[PDB]
Amino acid sequence: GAYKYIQELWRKKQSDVMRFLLRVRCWQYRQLSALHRAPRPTRPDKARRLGYKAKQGYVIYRIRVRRGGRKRPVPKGATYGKPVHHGVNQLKFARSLQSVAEERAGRHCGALRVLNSYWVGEDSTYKFFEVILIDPFHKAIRRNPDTQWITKPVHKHREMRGLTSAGRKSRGLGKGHKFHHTIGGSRRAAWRRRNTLQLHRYR
Amino acid sequence: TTLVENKKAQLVVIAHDVDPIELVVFLPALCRKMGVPYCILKGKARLGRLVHRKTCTTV
Amino acid sequence: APSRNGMILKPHFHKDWQRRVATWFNQPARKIRRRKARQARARRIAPRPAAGPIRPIVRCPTVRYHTKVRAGRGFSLEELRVAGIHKKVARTIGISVDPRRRNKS
Amino acid sequence: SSHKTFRIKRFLAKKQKQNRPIPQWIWMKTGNKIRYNSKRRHWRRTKLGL
Amino acid sequence: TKGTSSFGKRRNKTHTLCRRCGSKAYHLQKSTCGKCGYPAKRKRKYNWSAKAKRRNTTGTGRMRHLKIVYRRFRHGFREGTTPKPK
Amino acid sequence: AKIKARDLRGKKKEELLKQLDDLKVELSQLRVAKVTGGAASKLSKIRVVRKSIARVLTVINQTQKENLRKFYKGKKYKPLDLRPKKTRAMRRRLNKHEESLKTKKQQRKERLYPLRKYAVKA
Amino acid sequence: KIRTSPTFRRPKTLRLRRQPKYPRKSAPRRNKLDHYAIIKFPLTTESAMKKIEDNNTLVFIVDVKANKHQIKQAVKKLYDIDVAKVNTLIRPDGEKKAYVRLAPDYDALDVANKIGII
RNA sequence: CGCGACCUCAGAUCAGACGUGGCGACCCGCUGAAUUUAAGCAUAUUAGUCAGCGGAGGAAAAGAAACUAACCAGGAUUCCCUCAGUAACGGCGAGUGAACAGGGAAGAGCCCAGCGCCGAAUCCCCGCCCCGCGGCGGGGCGCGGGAAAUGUGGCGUACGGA
Ligand SMILES: [Mg+2]
Ligand SMILES: [Mg+2]
Ligand SMILES: [Mg+2]
Ligand SMILES: [Mg+2]
Ligand SMILES: [Mg+2]
Ligand SMILES: [Mg+2]
Ligand SMILES: [Mg+2]
Ligand SMILES: [Mg+2]
Ligand SMILES: [Mg+2]
Ligand SMILES: [Mg+2]
Ligand SMILES: [Mg+2]
Ligand SMILES: [Mg+2]
Ligand SMILES: [Mg+2]
Ligand SMILES: [Mg+2]
Ligand SMILES: [Mg+2]
Ligand SMILES: [Mg+2]
Ligand SMILES: [Mg+2]
Ligand SMILES: [Mg+2]
Ligand SMILES: [Mg+2]
Ligand SMILES: [Mg+2]
Ligand SMILES: [Mg+2]
Ligand SMILES: [Mg+2]
Ligand SMILES: [Mg+2]
Ligand SMILES: [Mg+2]
Ligand SMILES: [Mg+2]
Ligand SMILES: [Mg+2]
Ligand SMILES: [Zn+2]
């Protein structure tokens, strides 16, 4: 199969061939707008292993995100408080740029549901992501038993509640001693369990 | 590509303008090492007109 | 302020502990609900054991407890195939299976 | 103002209708606690908002 | 002139009645409602005023559709059929 | 006399409309009597006339929409009014067929390994 | 062909007409503001009596939604009388008082006796 | 020059659909203080808390090890008792502070991509016939129209598999 060969091609990003491709594609994406439908995935193998199928109801949106950190949206200086909170410049955002990308893509395309997303290019000021979206009402989707899980109401707006891969990579959840601070549902659930008095009837 | 790497192919026609080139960029070298003759043809549209579909990358 | 001889204590009551206090006034109700559900399950599976599938003998891990045995997760694949039951048939006839557990000895 | 608008005129119409007193035959029902209309309004004391 | 004689110049109004909530809080030059933010799609509502949340909420008005929804849920949203004819 | 909605079901739409018109004329005369100052008899009968209006109109509407549903009974696309008005979530819900149809792989698994009914001696 | 203007402008495409596969709503809405609900009852005050005796007019009160054309059509149908003109005003109570002046060849007093107000 | 494919990209009151807003006790994701304590105060505490923004369901989230351990070893997730005010953190000051093992409640596991083999063996829509119908589905017929080789369906997924 050619998908394996494409996989090592895309893992050899510093090669002159892939570097030329990435430069040209980045220039074209920069010339385009910030949020536009792609006709088809740029990386078919990566889309397939992220869950994309060549069926009616799967669309791909190519989207652009501005690069860098996050400065505190406070007037000119004036972070009124103790000196531990005077910083405004070198702050960093808790979610990833990929998460922000798929979040705003799913916000714009409100009737579709986000599956996943992947990296297609970047330069000094933008990053470019392709987001897979599924129409949960097209019958080729609703009649397929292995993909009608996403048509349930509980999976509405995955990317905003942080249930896709990009959002999950930032909630600090996982097995073992490295992830003690998230036992239970999440960080907030762990905190709520730990900071709660259990007053039995007999104490 | 699986036929070529099994050496079950006798010649390979590759369209010249696949819009990600990466899907075929590796194929001439693979064809050379397997010793399968390959040619590059103008037009994925007219190449996929051979089959009864809109487009085809290689035959 | 400290007084004559006594113990110096550290109460963890400096957060807002009163906005989240879990009382247990519904403990008898929860027990009754649990046992009613248990009886409903026991009589929906008519002739099958109430406690569920059989489970294997297990040693406790640490040095503090490695002299006692208890019930495990499921029967391992190696012992299951030694006994001659099939992987997909054990749990349909009532045998717990877990493919994660080794067999050292 | 003599130069009203339609919404304002309807508003004034409704409150003008509301500003009447209570009929006498209600004071004679079985379970009657009402002795006079307490939601009256005089054009010079209470100024209607707006 | 700070008080009584300056109270006499108050003769033109800054607020009028708005179309969503009917309160006299629609600023005319801002063209927005100070109570519900009418031009905005979403209702203006804050958690630092429990009284303001209580003054207009779901249980306050007429429940024209919602109480019928309750009465129908108690029977399971029957449709099409009618009780057995006499 | 006492117009009632049981002997009105079998009638025809044209005399239904004519009777409605007659009742409306009578109601208008009764309102004229009310405003000019009339008898308590007429002032009482205006309510009866209004309710006669209401039930005649109800019969007309019921028969019309019933025939309309009978017309659209078989067709695939029918007006939203004739479509079932359950809750929005229940209309968005998966239908009875596709919530039941299943994949070949695990239906094969079900037929190869059905769940058994057993018991264990004490 | 050639381009004589330096501006590209959007070409004129073809826009089809609605050919709906089913009506959105099943039935047309019944006309609720008809000739019977459009005029409610005539005033019988001293001013109305003086107007009908002198100016050969009639005085009705109607709902606020009626036009002068609608009012005169309704008067013509219900009372089979020709109408010269209509003057309307929204009364501070809320209804719409309508002064309907008839054609000279009819008599307002006779029509009033026929209707029943006098 | 014209004609014809394909690729990108427009315009439609085109045919059929879908989202918006509300509530918000419980939940998920960001943002996020200062009163206060330290007998002053700046790190620390208050506190990942109030306020702010977004998003659901009848629960949500989590979940079948890139785990715990160092034993004669256990075996998805979630909750309770204990571990434990402990290891650890901390102007080592004030203060903060888990996890494993053990006992219970419940108990359920699975699917892809990829590697391959099957003549795309796959799916959607329109028109017609019969049946069913207030969850729009079943059968048949169309040298009917599309999607799809830039990959649909069947087998198959680390416990190995063909
Ligand atoms: Mg943060
Ligand atoms: Mg990471
Ligand atoms: Mg003392
Ligand atoms: Mg005054
Ligand atoms: Mg002003
Ligand atoms: Mg809001
Ligand atoms: Mg499969
Ligand atoms: Mg249309
Ligand atoms: Mg912070
Ligand atoms: Mg202090
Ligand atoms: Mg002090
Ligand atoms: Mg101080
Ligand atoms: Mg300080
Ligand atoms: Mg803190
Ligand atoms: Mg809050
Ligand atoms: Mg919402
Ligand atoms: Mg709900
Ligand atoms: Mg869930
Ligand atoms: Mg999940
Ligand atoms: Mg695994
Ligand atoms: Mg554990
Ligand atoms: Mg102790
Ligand atoms: Mg803390
Ligand atoms: Mg434990
Ligand atoms: Mg048990
Ligand atoms: Mg495949
Ligand atoms: Zn308002």
Curated annotation (Swiss-Prot), chain A:
SMART domains from the UniProt entry: Ribosomal_L15e
Cross-link Glycyl lysine isopeptide (Lys-Gly) (interchain with G-Cter in SUMO2): residue positions: K82
Bias (Basic residues) ranges: 168-181
Domain of life the protein comes from: Eukaryota
Keyword Ribosomal protein: yes
Phosphoserine: residues bearing it: S33, S96, S99
Gene3D superfamilies referenced in this protein's UniProt entry, alphabetically: Ribosomal protein l15e (3.40.1120.10)
Annotated lipid attachment (N-myristoyl glycine): G1
Keyword line: Cytoplasm, Isopeptide bond, Lipoprotein, Myristate, Phosphoprotein, Ribonucleoprotein, Ribosomal protein, Ubl conjugation
UniProt keyword Phosphoprotein, yes or no: yes
GO (cellular component) term, any one: cytosolic large ribosomal subunit
Pfam families reported in the protein's UniProt record: Ribosomal_L15e
Biological process according to GO: cytoplasmic translation
Quaternary assembly: Component of the large ribosomal subunit. Interacts with IFIT1 (via TPR repeats 1-4).
NCBIfam families, sorted: PRK04243.1 (NF003269)
Primary role: Component of the large ribosomal subunit. The ribosome is a large ribonucleoprotein complex responsible for the synthesis of proteins in the cell.
Protein name (Swiss-Prot/TrEMBL): Large ribosomal subunit protein eL15
Gene: RPL15
Curated annotation (Swiss-Prot), chain E:
Residues bearing PTM N6-acetyllysine: K9
Any one Gene Ontology cellular component term annotated for this protein: synapse
Subunit record text: Component of the large ribosomal subunit.
Entry superkingdom: Eukaryota
Function: Component of the large ribosomal subunit. The ribosome is a large ribonucleoprotein complex responsible for the synthesis of proteins in the cell.
Biological process terms in GO annotation: positive regulation of signal transduction by p53 class mediator; translation
Binding-site residues for Zn(2+), renumbered to this chain: C18, C21, C33, C36
Protein family: Belongs to the eukaryotic ribosomal protein eL37 family.
UniProt-recorded Gene Ontology molecular function terms: MDM2/MDM4 family protein binding; rRNA binding; structural constituent of ribosome; ubiquitin ligase inhibitor activity; zinc ion binding
Zinc finger motifs (C4-type), residue ranges: 18-36
Name used for this protein in its record: Large ribosomal subunit protein eL37
Keywords noted in UniProt: Acetylation, Cytoplasm, Metal-binding, Phosphoprotein, Ribonucleoprotein, Ribosomal protein, RNA-binding, rRNA-binding, Zinc, Zinc-finger
Cell compartments where the protein resides: Cytoplasm
Curated annotation (Swiss-Prot), chain F:
GO MF, any single term: structural constituent of ribosome
PROSITE patterns according to UniProt: RIBOSOMAL_L29
InterPro entries tied to this protein: Ribosomal_uL29, Ribosomal_uL29_CS, Ribosomal_uL29_euk, Ribosomal_uL29_sf
Modified residues (N6-acetyllysine): K18, K42
Function: Component of the large ribosomal subunit. The ribosome is a large ribonucleoprotein complex responsible for the synthesis of proteins in the cell.
Family per record: Belongs to the universal ribosomal protein uL29 family.
Subunit text: Component of the large ribosomal subunit.
Protein name as catalogued: Large ribosomal subunit protein uL29
